[model samples]
Target: PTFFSTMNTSFSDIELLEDSGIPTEAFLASCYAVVPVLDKLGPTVFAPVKMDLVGNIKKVNQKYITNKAKFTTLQKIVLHEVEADVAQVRNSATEALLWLKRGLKFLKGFLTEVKNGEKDIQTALNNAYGKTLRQHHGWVVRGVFALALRAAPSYEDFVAALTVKEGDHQKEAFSIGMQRDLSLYLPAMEKQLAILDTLYEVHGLESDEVV
Candidate 1:
């Protein structure tokens, strides 16, 4: 099976705990799953995206490791930083999660468009970027994305990269199956993001200082 087929942390795998917060470990793992898809694009072009996502995961995970009992939910991580009065610091757990969520939003939007029959990879990627990450980025970062858009693979190849194998039968079946799986995952993704977004907004941790 391919990386996508054997993924242990699909967004569908995330569950809301009774406290109404997403499990920290599950959320980070789901975020890691985005790396494979990003690599299918030009890895060099998307390396910064991968680095930022992984870096944030590490930041949040480090906090979780220090106090597993307290940092069980992602919301708790943000609140921890908030109470410490470092939530707005550039390197705080709150900031890490803010960017991580944006990256995941980009993935969610891209996959949703593909599943809904957007056959053009650039269109899907560009549209997703425009909606989710573009406004948050400055000119230099936006230029990097322009390069990524030009380097994107075809939709057929992208699907094959996500399948168990690359061929007619494998691609066709995976394409159909992916639509079903994505239907299940996107909502869970949205719910998790909303939980975090509210946490950031209510506490005034979110920033518009583009970089």
Candidate 2:
């Protein structure tokens, strides 16, 4: 089985995170953190399981996909390419994701399915054995996980699922910074309000409250 490709982190991103005081470890976790959202957003983009007219299909240990995709380059890494019969344009996970917003022809269930995947993935995780899941997973397995995560995102998973068509460089880091910035008022707000009130009294704006 071909190993799934990992994305390269950029020096620019590293610096952006650094300038904003985001640790790389934290960012990596954030990537994992956002998996649910990505998965939720990815269903509209699945590898094809059955072809038309040709009507050929691939099986995941004999389980057919109600889950789906376009044509897939997925077979590229499969060692036993026995059913190399029906042929068409190859598809990819990335392409599937992008298809969600093809002009105005927006695909609906992609998001719906991702949410379902998110809601349903915990069961799969509960039975996980490091013996099978601890190492690098292949594209097929990776796709399954992606689908599960996005199928049901928690409310907290917002930033993770944002569309990046325009691109995302400092976006995630900036999001972290927003929380950091908001935390300036973390421990006390009433006390801070009290302090402001005293200053306001000096300016006769207390009861007058006009200013």
Candidate with top lDDT is: 1
**Local accuracy of candidate 1 as per-residue lDDT tens digits, 1-211:** 3344456657777778877889989888888886877788658877987898889999889889999999999888888787888777666787788888888888889878987889998999999999999999899989988987888888767766676555743545665677667777888888888877887788887788898
lDDT for each residue of candidate 2 in 98-146, tens digit (9 for 90 to 100): 1211210111123222223333333333223123232334567556645
Which parts of model 1 have CA positions greater than 4 angstroms off? Answer: 1-5, 168-171
lDDT of 1 at 206: 77
Candidates' lDDT values, in order?
Answer: 0.80, 0.28
Q: How high is the lDDT of residue 76 in model 1?
A: 83
Q: Which ten residues in a row are the worst by lDDT in model 1? A: 1-10
TM-score list, all predictions: 0.92, 0.16
Q: Evaluated with TM-score, which candidate comes out highest?
A: 1
